[PDB]
């Protein structure tokens with residue numbers, strides 16, 4: 001997959017937007033599927049890329065929530081840029097994924113990663129999309145971006 005090239009660039013720029021859209025990061029006090037990422041770290045390349053597309057798309061979907069962000073002072077244009085940077089890389093990777101054999105059973109990584117993002121959305125709702133609920137989500141997304149970059153490195 002050609003599109004795993006220069007991925008560090010996506011990582012750097014996206015983490016930059018994530019950092020600049022708001023205040024300093026909150027402490028990580030929310031669940032994160034490190035278990036899953038460990039598994040992905042040593043999975044085959046086809047699975048790694050499929051996993052990157054799945055996760056990118058989940059992050060885009062989570063963050064595309066201007067209608068629920070009154071409680072944060074984040075710069076919305078920076079949010080939009082964040083969405084866009086990740087959507088473009090994701091759309092490139094989807095090209096490689098189209099080439100892969102679409103397998104026997106739903107992969108456990110797709111199930112688990114969805115399950116995690118579900119949890120995050122649930123948390124935001126329970127907390128009525130408060131500033132600290134959003135700041136947890138933001139801190140969590142930082143962690144995904146850091147681990148995704150490792151997977152991309154190892155994948156290439």
Ligand code: NI
Nearest residue numbers: 057058061117
């Ligand atoms: Ni989603």
